């Protein structure tokens, strides 16, 4: 929730890595699972997940009207 962490430094030690595979194939039957000539389209997608508490926040040491409202739905 905190927007203070914008433009800062983060260090983590236990973060999971996830890669998503998308394949568009035209395999005729089960027997042809051996030969590799039946693949047409390929793709990839990578992102990183980790709990913030286990990580460490480190600020970057680079050398008036307001109102209160409560969010209900986005």
């Amino acid at each position: 929730s905190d927007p203070r962490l914008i433009g800062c430094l983060v260090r983590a030690e236990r973060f999971q890595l996830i890669v998503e595979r998308d394949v568009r194939s035209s395999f005729p039957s089960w027997k042809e699972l051996s030969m590799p000539g039946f693949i047409q389209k390929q793709q990839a997608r990578v992102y990183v997940q980790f709990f913030l508490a286990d990580a460490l926040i480190l600020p970057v040491p680079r050398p008036g009207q307001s109102r209160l409202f409560l969010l209900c739905h986005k």
């Binding site: 260090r11 030690e13 460490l56 480190l58 040491p61």
Partner: protein, 507 residues
């Protein structure tokens, strides 16, 4: 030609300006003496091209060189094009000799720093004249040259590269300085004086209660030399004298007064010397007693004409040459292309400026480590504080350019080695992490100089606190404080390099 007489007149004017002392009455005969000396030196070699004077070389003052010269340059008396080419060939087929200069210098051999004589006397050799003072380094120091003006036949000046280096620079000389005029050497002790051999000194030390206010002279052969220990206002080094072959027995002698610290560059291994009027006072932390030099203590050579009666490291003495520099601030250098040099664990503040690839070195009482792991596998040689580095000559290679861009961050290294006391494999891994992080983040994220800033209170470095989750886990605080006295004296010497353990890569 008339140009020669004009040059002589200009040199006379220069002598009148800066080479005429204001202490005594300035009398003109010094200029013909200098002219005769330079003529004799110029004609001694026999390489002259028919010229009785070095018209190519031009006199210059220390202040003039400081104000004008901005790049490293080498100038040596009686040097020709063939001499420079032979010098370049000696520098190596791929070597880059420093540019040749045609100059001449005259100065005073002294260690006095400035108006505050005893508040800045670090013992470094200096060359001083009426225009300024500038340091120097000599291969073999001689006490007969201090305080007297000597003509320098060979010299080289190295200006600072990076503006972070506020130091003025230094001079490096190859040949012995030429005396301008004969000097009246004070005669030594004509009457023969008995000395005490190191075995006799050890026997007297065994007589603990028989050393009450007794002062005598000790003589022996120097075998082991300690480094230059520095502190808040007291600088000292310890010399050991023992009857060589076998030098099993050695004695303790402390040189603490800064006045005679200049002799630290004069002691030589193997050579025997005479030390006179040594006193004994109790030293904390050691039950034994030590013989230390008095105020009026004279150091001479030993000539019988006037003398009467988990793993562990390996220690060895070896001599090699440096090939290339891998990290100036980290103190990691290549030994003959095969081994690694680690000068981090010693105070080398004035050593990094003069050292450069292309110098042969001699090492005594150093620790050899193998199977370090954690990134590198080449064996490393590390000198403990008991031993010291030995200098023999200089190099001829041109300095690099990256040293003035991303090199001056040594304050963090000093804090790590001293204020944090890291082990050698951990130190190397931490260094490598620093270069990797600097490559990954700097300079767009932050400037290199600010990233590697010392960790003063209220402003710590990002890298050290980033590594803290690993450093604290690997090396929790609680290690005993390293003391120079114990490692130098107590037997066996307790140093972090005495015992080592191979470490795996943490992250």
């Amino acid at each position: 030609p008339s140009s020669e007489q004009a040059w002589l007149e200009d040199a006379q004017v220069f002598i009148q300006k800066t080479l005429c002392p204001a202490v005594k009455e300035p009398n003109v005969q010094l200029t013909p003496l200098v002219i005769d000396c330079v003529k004799t030196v110029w004609l001694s070699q026999g390489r002259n091209q028919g010229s009785t004077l070095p018209l190519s070389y031009s006199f210059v003052s220390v202040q003039d060189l400081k104000t004008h010269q901005r790049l490293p340059c080498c100038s040596h008396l009686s040097w020709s094009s063939s001499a420079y080419q032979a010098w370049a060939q000696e520098a190596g087929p791929n070597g880059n000799p420093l540019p040749r200069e045609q100059l001449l210098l005259l100065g005073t051999l002294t260690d006095l720093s400035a108006d505050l004589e005893q508040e800045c006397r670090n013992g470094s050799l200096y060359v001083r004249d009426n225009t300024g003072v500038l340091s120097c380094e000599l291969i073999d120091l001689d006490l007969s040259w201090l305080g007297h003006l000597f003509l320098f036949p060979r010299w080289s000046y190295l200006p600072p590269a990076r503006w972070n280096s506020s130091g003025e620079g230094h001079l490096e000389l190859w040949d012995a300085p030429v005396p301008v005029f004969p000097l009246t050497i004070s005669p030594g002790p004509v009457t023969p004086i008995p000395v005490l051999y190191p075995e006799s000194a050890s026997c007297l030390l065994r007589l603990r209660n028989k050393l009450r206010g007794v002062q005598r002279n000790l003589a022996g052969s120097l075998v082991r030399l300690s480094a230059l220990v520095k502190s808040k206002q007291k600088a000292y080094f310890i010399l050991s004298l023992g009857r060589s072959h076998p030098a099993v027995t050695h004695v303790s002698i402390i040189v603490q007064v800064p006045a005679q610290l200049v002799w630290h560059r004069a002691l030589r291994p193997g050579t025997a010397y005479v030390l006179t009027e040594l006193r004994v006072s109790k030293i904390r932390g050691q039950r034994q007693h030590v013989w230390m030099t008095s105020q009026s203590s004279r150091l001479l050579l030993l000539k019988p004409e006037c003398v009467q009666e988990v793993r562990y490291s390996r220690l060895l003495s070896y001599s090699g040459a440096v090939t290339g520099v891998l990290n100036e601030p980290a103190g990691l250098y290549e030994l003959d292309g095969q081994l690694g040099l680690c000068l981090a664990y010693q105070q080398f503040r004035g050593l990094r400026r003069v050292m450069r690839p292309g110098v042969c070195l001699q090492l005594q009482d150093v620790h050899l480590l193998q199977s370090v792991g954690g990134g590198t596998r080449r064996p490393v040689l590390a000198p403990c504080l008991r031993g010291a580095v030995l200098l023999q000559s200089f190099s001829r290679q041109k300095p690099g350019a990256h040293s003035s861009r991303q090199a001056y961050g040594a304050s963090l290294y000093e804090q790590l080695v001293w204020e944090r006391q890291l082990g050698l494999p951990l130190y190397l891994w931490a260094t490598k992490a620093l270069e990797e992080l600097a490559c990954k983040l700097c300079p767009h994220v932050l400037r290199h100089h600010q990233f590697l800033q010392h960790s003063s209170p209220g402003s710590p470095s990002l890298g050290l606190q980033l590594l803290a989750p690993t450093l604290d886990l690997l090396a929790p605080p609680g290690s005993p404080v390293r003391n120079a006295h114990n490692e130098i004296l107590e037997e066996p010497h307790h140093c972090p390099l005495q015992k080592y353990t191979r470490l795996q890569t943490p992250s």
